């Protein structure tokens, strides 16, 4: 059903790419390639409707331009001093840029992309250049490590002081991808390039809500990097996160995430395993952006009846903790919502006054850190608040019957989190 | 194909594709494994300590200890626990009987610990320090950042701590770390400016300026117009009254609510007045502003029109910035 | 073994060469050797015979006191003068000039 249409497409599109390949031979001075570009760009834009029509037909059309198509000819078209049409090539390249093309252009296009990045003033060009950079950054550790050092970062940062939705959206998404996909090294460099303070314009623009969310997802991930935490904090943009997550609704942006075309921030097991870090950080500005996003997906993924993702990504237990030892209303609202959207029961928050806990509250926390196997032994030995806070390895092993050293160790780890949240006022 | 398997090439290739960084050396590895037909392992995410039980099972399979995957799932070892496994836990709890096998396990683990990205847990880049002594030391990062040591504390640790707490086992290694530690003993209401503006119109310029000025060593404050509580936002003006320099963003009609604000309730109006009151350095920034009649403003703020302003240009942003800085005191 | 610890140990006494791997695994190299203790040699490096430890250790302690601008640039056509380019560099490097070569492949980074 889908393939039949993809095939049908390729039957027109490949000879149309050849109709373009004829034009691809000349320049855009006389619009010889100019028309051809306008054609094939809009032809893959007509075929860009197909991922929506089906599910990610993008690959088909892209592979055509890649394997034997004038992919490299378009890269040379960028180099070609037909600036008028070199943006048209860029526009088209930005479109035809699936993982396949990305890897290939990482080998060749990368150089020419950056050579074209140094061109700044032409806004429409810049939009499409920041565009290709955005896709480029999300390729590989070394691809970031490259672009960053080569002034790819310096391009998106110099374009972050401009005034154009698409340009700005792109820049935000880039610094996002760059922070996420790049290593320790990449990240340090960004913050030392004053990238945190440069996201402020984007996050401080009530005008555009989606720009903000993207801008903040970026700065939030930088603050997870403990080594550069402080520099991001003092930037000021980190305080600006929490209000924003309150304003928007995950559901509302879930709809806007259906049609992300997997080019901006499309739903996928990748993104989920890269949000879980945030949900699991120190910074509550991160744990907010964390929950907000993972909640936007908790919507779509339940609608697609593929909940099994989150469970395996290690998101559910993380969310439970954000709702157990919570203080902030927002980060906890979001957590509750998400757990409900996945269908998994939402844990009630823990009373923090541990040492005054009865056997009942010990059973509740034993269940929310999932050690239910052990609830029975804890009731039979009537461990309450005081005893819990004082458990030794020996008691845990012998009396409470936790055979496994590794399990003891995971227990204690959970306990230490409790002891740290505790309100010890009574004692 | 049986040649490669016996030559000990397949497992070697798998490692070049598991802990890879370089594109080429990894492309080649993938190709080779496919050409032999043996499945090609996906690369490992390097951020070990944030790994869930799922990623531990994947790496257990790519270093071929699948015999053990089940025990690792039953004891739900994840990232943190993996990096902290002891011989005892491995023997008893995870059920690796053989000393020789434990030894091959640990050898594989140490390779992991050395490739790990420890960014989420290491605020002081202790990883790179240890890595400078000797690249083989980087493996002790997590053990040290868990006892909480950081670069500043390192100068104080004892041989015993390194051994028990941080689980560095080789005396020789302790001794070198410890020594280099001890050489690290000697080798370890008033912002400057306030920007007042209409959140609806001048919000853009506001931020932009703040950034630029912050780069240039001015601590700035912004007109976060959202708050009315706390004695008609007296805290708002504590900042302005204290802000030596006052940037006013004059967008086309930025003085609407200020215009005839006799209750002095509009935050912009208020600020103008209080700045003028304190005799603050007022620099209007002109970006489409048409200058009104002073009479249309309350008298307390009319004189703000009598401050010489600077023409904003996005095109020559930096040049404009330098002039603005010049006007700041 | 980056420091030929094998040959050093082998000079003390040919029977000692057998401890090479055990020492290069605790990471000791020639420069560090002057600092090791009897205990380390025993536990870490697994030298078992006291007598042997003692001799190594002693000879270690006698090793305490016994442990944008290149000169030239070659510019040339990669298609034609590539040969001569390399040849010169080599020759000049032998003769104590640090040389640089016209690696013509790169256009990025402000022309
Ligand atoms: C809704 C619940 C807690 C959030 C507190 C909101 C504060 O502003 C409690 C229900 C838990 O499942
Ligand atoms: C092809 C894969 C990694 C190589 C990265 C290329 C970077 O330039 C991943 C598939 C693994 O089996």
Numbering used by the authors:
A (entry chain A): 56 to 482
B (entry chain B): 362 to 549, 560 to 700
C (entry chain C): 483 to 549, 560 to 603
Published text:
The domain composition of SARM1 includes an N-terminal peptide, an ARM-repeats region, two SAM, and one TIR domain, which mediate mitochondria targeting, auto-inhibition, oligomerization, and NADase activity, respectively. Subsequently, studies have demonstrated that SARM1 is also a key part of a highly conserved axonal death pathway that is activated by nerve injury. Here, we present structural data and complementary biochemical assays to show that SARM1 is kept inactive through a ‘substrate inhibition’ mechanism, where the high concentration of NAD+ stabilizes the tightly packed, inhibited conformation of the protein. In this way, SARM1 activation is triggered by a decrease in the concentration of a cellular metabolite NAD+, rather than depending on the introduction of an activating factor.
